[PDB]
């Protein structure tokens, strides 16, 4: 799973920016979103998103989908480390369970349900 | 810049 992010910047210079955007936004956590690699969606101009720890992943699943401008009927998921993140879980537990050393969560998006495909 | 929802 490649992010643009990752390749965009070195290791030190996302670990400065997540630690940064984590103590001005306690309550809230920082995501990188970008499209999956084949994925039949549309783009999302904008992928640095700083997200409430208490919405829910379904929740954050809606505001990006109306990011790319589609509609609830539409065939639409999310990666995280290659695998669906639970529905029900917080913003807040999918960031301290998954974020990288950097301090992001990283999460891709496709509309397919296996990452690349 | 950074995106914030909701």
Redesign the interface.
Known sequence: MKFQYKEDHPFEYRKKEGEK?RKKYPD?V?VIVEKAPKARVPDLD?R?????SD?TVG??YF?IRKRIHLRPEDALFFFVNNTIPPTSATMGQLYEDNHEEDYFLYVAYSDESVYGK | ?6
């Open positions: 955007i809230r920082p904008k640095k998103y700083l997200v409430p919405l929740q954050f505001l | 810049s950074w995106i914030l929802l909701n």
